[PDB]
Every structure is written in structure tokens, then in C-alpha cells.
């Protein structure tokens, strides 16, 4: 989607505590319970994650029912990476 990463970071936090959230298919309401991000953005952000795995896919009345997988949690541990020093070799030489 064409939605910045700043609004994505919010969603992630509530998905670690839960991992199922819902949001009625009615656009422009501005806020969900919890997530303070519009109903255009959040619903379609879930869709983007959903298509890339992360989620077991059931439709069912007017919400689109997303249930995170174990793999899902790990995938979301790249947005909020874990406690944020995550390891391997990203610089290119000292100064000197």
C-alpha cells in the first residue's frame, strides 16, 4: 500500500499482545479501538501483510478474519525488530 511505515509500527505492538484485531468495513472513521489510524489505512495494511503469508485466511462477514501464524510473529519482528540491536554487519569499514 501507499501508507508510510510510521502507521505500520502502531499495529505491530497490538499484534504481539493479541494477534487478532478487527475493524469494520466502513471507511473514514479515523480511529479503531486501540489503533489511532484511519479505517482506509489499517484495513488495507492488514491485507498487505495477509497476502505475504503471516496470516491464515478466512473471509466471514464483513471484517475479513485474520489470524496470525507463528511465522507471522517473526515477520512482524522486522518492523519492531525485537529490542532493536539485531545484529549482523551493516557498516562498511572504519574511518581512520
Amino acid at each position: 500500500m501507499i501508507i508510510p511505515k510510521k502507521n505500520r509500527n502502531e499495529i505491530c505492538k497490538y499484534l504481539f499482545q493479541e494477534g487478532v484485531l478487527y475493524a469494520k468495513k466502513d471507511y473514514n472513521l479515523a480511529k479503531h479501538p486501540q489503533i489511532d489510524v484511519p479505517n482506509l489505512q489499517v484495513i488495507k495494511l492488514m491485507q498487505s501483510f495477509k497476502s505475504k503469508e503471516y496470516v491464515r485466511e478466512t473471509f466471514s462477514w464483513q471484517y475479513y478474519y485474520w489470524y496470525l501464524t507463528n511465522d507471522g510473529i517473526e515477520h512482524l519482528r522486522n518492523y519492531l525488530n525485537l529490542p532493536s540491536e539485531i545484529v549482523p554487519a551493516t557498516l562498511k569499514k572504519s574511518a581512520r
Binding site: S84, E85, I86, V87, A89, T90, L91, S94
Partner: peptide
């Protein structure tokens, strides 16, 4: 190893400009 292992931390912080 104070060469390329410096910036480990802040790639994960999401803070590289």
C-alpha cells in the same frame, strides 16, 4: 572488527538516514 560491526545496532533501530 570495529569496522563493519559498528552499525549493527542502529539498522535495527530504524534510524539510518
Amino acid at each position: 572488527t570495529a569496522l563493519q560491526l559498528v552499525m549493527k545496532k542502529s539498522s535495527a533501530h530504524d534510524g539510518l538516514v
